[PDB]
Design an enzyme around this catalytic site. Structure first.
Site, PDB file in Angstrom:
ATOM      1  N   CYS A  45      38.592  25.971  39.361  1.00 41.12           N
ATOM      2  CA  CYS A  45      40.000  25.699  39.029  1.00 41.12           C
ATOM      3  C   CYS A  45      40.882  25.787  40.271  1.00 41.12           C
ATOM      4  CB  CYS A  45      40.482  26.687  37.971  1.00 41.12           C
ATOM      5  SG  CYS A  45      40.098  26.199  36.336  1.00 41.12           S
TER       6      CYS A  45
ATOM      7  N   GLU B 139      40.130  28.917  42.392  1.00 35.85           N
ATOM      8  CA  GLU B 139      39.530  30.055  43.066  1.00 35.85           C
ATOM      9  C   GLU B 139      39.190  29.672  44.488  1.00 35.85           C
ATOM     10  OE1 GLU B 139      38.815  28.752  39.830  1.00 35.85           O
ATOM     11  OE2 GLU B 139      36.938  29.737  39.433  1.00 35.85           O
TER      12      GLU B 139
HETATM   13  C1  LIG Z   1      37.690  30.186  34.035  1.00 38.39           C
HETATM   14  N1  LIG Z   1      36.546  29.803  34.747  1.00 38.39           N
HETATM   15  C2  LIG Z   1      37.110  29.461  36.199  1.00 38.39           C
HETATM   16  C3  LIG Z   1      36.588  28.349  36.449  1.00 38.39           C
HETATM   17  O1  LIG Z   1      35.796  28.437  37.585  1.00 38.39           O
HETATM   18  C4  LIG Z   1      35.423  28.388  35.552  1.00 38.39           C
HETATM   19  C5  LIG Z   1      36.204  28.669  34.315  1.00 38.39           C
HETATM   20  C6  LIG Z   1      35.192  28.646  33.186  1.00 38.39           C
HETATM   21  O2  LIG Z   1      34.014  28.701  33.358  1.00 38.39           O
HETATM   22  O3  LIG Z   1      35.461  28.507  32.022  1.00 38.39           O
END
Ligand SMILES: CN1C[C@@H](O)C[C@H]1C(=O)O
Length: 780
Positions: A429, A431
């Site tokens: 997202c 990160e």
């Molecule tokens: C909230 N996570 C962050 C994103 O990398 C992956 C997501 C999920 O797997 O649902």
């Protein structure tokens, strides 16, 4: 112009159906290698998978492969989450969110050799029985969402792709033999390290195997090919697939097949969200350059390849249970590809190849190359910046924009030095991570700040389920001052995160023993350690991260109490409690003066201040705690849980009706940003970004009547620079008639392949559940 291979509408007219093939191979691999050390019997049945797996090349492809047997297939890994399907065996087909078709006959396999072997042996099953007492309640009472990362494998990391292109499995095998020769089974600790190293040898062998069966199919397709052209492309798809992983890439073609070949294997074994291919514009450039000045590829032959790769990226479907889908609708893989930023010597890092990776998303316009940017205002040319903004106002959702200068110190704030942290790449997202060198659940579990607000006003007990969920902070009508209040709001934060640290610590210990790989095959340290990603092995091990959601709703709810109760003394708490308990049924004069109080987003100092206090506290709070892999980290990203978290929170002193969505990320609540769009940024600058080193998320919904004047471009750009100049981390845009969305819930069919930005990723509007569709609609 002539790349008219959109004949990959094949992908849009395809239906999601379970693919229990690989699940059967794995079952057979395990049974015949029982008694082996788990990494060896895991990696021995991975070779089995790619040795006895479907192999298929589709009618127009130039780049090939697929982690399964079907397109848009749902991959079951029965070692981690077998029982997910046994639960929904006869609904999953028709469930509301993220459904998959379970064929008449795939379901024979499931309860005939999949279920009778795996019953009581899975990761996820161990999690359900071990989740700590207090964590488990809070999960139930809607307060946080931990179960996601016990069904979905590791993910959330960008692997060592650059090595596999540059050495091939040939050169990695040398690294394996180097450290195996330095060990001695006579010596205390060495048998485990020699035994693992064998598993790394099978999995190298298994990839080899696979890639050659692929060329083999491409010769078979040739020696039956009428079309002169499509025959001579098959022969080069074999000339490639023969080299590709085994040996080092030599041409552009041969790099993109190295990459994606590896990409699908890692997704073959575990199926996690967010396997980010990463700085694709940086390590592929040397191949692009030398192939241009040699003739082997022409710029247009380049962007054709890419546009195919992009359709392959759009191919798989992330598998999840009934409920985790609600918290992240749309099948999203989150495969982050990023362009632009800074070089190993601190200079601009943007070549022709950065633009053509922006270009292939303007062309294909499917959802699954999660595009991203690392804009370095002091380094990246305005020309770069223009091409970014032109992309955006395709209403595509892409690409997410990060302020490179912020992303670097986020990675420094993680303990990585500038000598390696310049390479940071958006992950999933919003990160952060680092190619080949960082283990890290960049978002282990979400925690519901709405529930918390509802807890201090209710003294722990959950309004909806009527249980003593949290600790008893005292009931709100004995808080003499405002600080007595804030005190109890912190105490309530503290109780929840503890439980999350327990849960994280518990699932770290489950991932440990039992969730090994050969993704690790592409981490240099994992090889010389003889130690897996799961166990340690990665260069820099980082504590798991804890994403908050309900920012807008904490600030607005808490400041609503400071204002009306503790220094404007307009309402006594006495009555506020009464008002929200009843959803403002009778009390709809109160709901009014709340949405009268300053709101987070219009940029009132009294608010921005509290916004800083709280979250510097929430950061200090998490970095308190440590697991086996370093101290915890935090972020602010919802995915899609802001909606279903909304459904469990009562009404709140923010003026929010009961059971509505919570805010999304660091954006305001829908209908409270009556000040500007330049004061949307300014309110969010006061969020301390570098303390939340795992990411920050901003949503903004532009109206399409903007792409009109011949400055909408010039003017969107300059706004991007406000963002960066203010020290904000990330912003991304929708650009859409509401008219279109509203019709599309009516007639889902004549709106296939229509895109939207949800939060961090991009889905097909029609394929999302209606709740989240409204949420996205109501945004200003
Ligand atoms: C909230 N996570 C962050 C994103 O990398 C992956 C997501 C999920 O797997 O649902």
């Amino acid at each position: 112009l002539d790349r008219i291979k959109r004949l990959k509408e094949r992908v849009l007219n395809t239906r999601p159906e379970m693919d229990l093939e690989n699940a059967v191979l794995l079952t057979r691999g395990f049974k015949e290698s029982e008694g082996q050390p788990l990494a060896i019997q895991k990696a021995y049945s991975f070779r089995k998978q790619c040795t006895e797996k479907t192999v298929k090349i589709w009618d127009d492809e130039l780049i090939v492969g697929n982690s399964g047997s079907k397109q848009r297939g749902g991959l079951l890994n029965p070692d981690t989450c077998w029982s997910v399907l046994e639960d929904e065996i006869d609904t999953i087909s028709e469930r509301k969110y993220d459904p998959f078709y379970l064929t008449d006959i795939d379901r024979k396999r499931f309860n005939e050799e999949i279920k009778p072997y795996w019953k009581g042996r899975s990761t996820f099953e161990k999690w359900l029985v071990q989740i700590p007492k207090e964590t488990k309640i809070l999960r139930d009472c809607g307060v946080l969402y931990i179960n996601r990362k016990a069904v979905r494998g590791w993910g959330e990391t960008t692997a060592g792709y650059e090595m596999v292109i540059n050495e091939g499995i040939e050169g990695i095998k040398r690294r394996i033999e180097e450290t195996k020769n330095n060990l001695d089974i006579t010596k205390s600790g060495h048998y485990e390290k020699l035994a693992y190293l064998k598993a790394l040898s099978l999995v190298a062998e298994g990839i080899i195997i696979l890639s050659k069966r692929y060329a083999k199919e491409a010769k078979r397709l040739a020696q039956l090919e009428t079309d002169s052209k499509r025959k001579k492309e098959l022969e080069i798809i074999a000339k490639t697939c023969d080299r590709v992983p085994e040996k080092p890439a030599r041409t552009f073609r041969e790099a993109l097949q190295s990459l994606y070949f590896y990409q699908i294997c890692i997704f073959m074994e575990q199926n996690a969200a967010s396997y980010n291919p990463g700085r694709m514009d940086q390590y592929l450039y040397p191949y692009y350059k030398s192939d241009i000045e040699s003739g082997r590829i022409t710029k247009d032959e380049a962007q054709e390849l890419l546009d195919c790769l992009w359709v392959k990226f759009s191919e798989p479907c992330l598998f999840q249970d009934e409920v985790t889908a609600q918290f992240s609708a749309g099948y999203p893989m989150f495969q982050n590809v990023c362009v632009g930023g800074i070089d190993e010597r601190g200079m601009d890092a943007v070549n022709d190849l950065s633009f053509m990776i922006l270009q292939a998303t303007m062309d294909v316009q499917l959802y699954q190359p999660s595009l991203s940017v690392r804009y370095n205002m002091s380094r990246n040319s305005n020309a770069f910046l223009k091409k970014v903004a032109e992309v955006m106002k395709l209403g595509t959702g892409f690409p997410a924009f990060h302020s490179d200068e912020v992303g670097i110190q986020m990675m420094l704030n993680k303990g990585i030095p500038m000598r390696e942290a310049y390479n940071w790449n958006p992950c999933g997202c919003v990160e952060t991570n680092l190619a080949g060198k960082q283990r890290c659940y960049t978002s282990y579990a979400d925690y519901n700040l709405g529930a918390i607000v509802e807890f201090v006003m209710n003294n722990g007990k959950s309004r909806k389920y009527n249980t003593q969920a949290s600790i008893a902070t005292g009931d709100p009508c004995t808080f003499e001052t405002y600080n007595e209040f804030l005190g109890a709001v912190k105490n309530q934060i503290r109780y929840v995160i503890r439980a999350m640290v327990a849960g994280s610590h518990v699932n770290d210990d489950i991932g440990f023993e039992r969730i090994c790989p050969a993704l690790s095959l592409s981490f240099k340290e994992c090889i010389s350690s003889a130690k897996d990603y799961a166990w340690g092995g990665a260069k820099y091990n980082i504590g798991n991260g804890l994403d908050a959601i309900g920012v807008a709703d904490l600030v607005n709810s808490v400041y609503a109490v400071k204002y009306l109760v503790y220094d404007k003394k307009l309402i006594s708490m006495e009555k506020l409690v009464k008002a929200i308990s009843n959803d403002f049924e009778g009390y709809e004069e109160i709901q009014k003066m709340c949405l009268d109080v300053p709101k987070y987003g219009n940029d009132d100092e009294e608010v921005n201040e509290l916004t800083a206090d709280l979250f510097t506290f929430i950061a200090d709070l998490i970095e308190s705690f440590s697991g086996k892999f370093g101290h915890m980290t935090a972020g602010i990203l919802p995915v899609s849980g802001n909606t279903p978290f909304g459904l469990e929170v009562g009404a709140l002193p923010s003026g929010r009706n009961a059971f509505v969505p919570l805010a999304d990320g660091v954006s305001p609540t829908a209908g409270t940003d009556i000040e500007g769009m330049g004061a949307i940024i300014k309110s969010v600058s006061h969020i301390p970004h570098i303390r939340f080193n795992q990411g920050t998320l901003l949503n903004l919904k532009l109206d399409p009547v903007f792409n009109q004047n011949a400055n909408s471009t010039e003017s969107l750009m300059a706004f991007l620079k406000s963002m960066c100049s203010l020290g904000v981390f990330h912003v991304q845009f929708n650009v859409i008639d509401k008219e279109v969305l509203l019709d599309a819930q009516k007639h889902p069919e004549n709106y296939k392949g229509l895109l939207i930005r949800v939060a961090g990723y991009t889905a097909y509007f029609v394929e999302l559940g209606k709740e989240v569709q409204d949420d996205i609609i109501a945004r200003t």
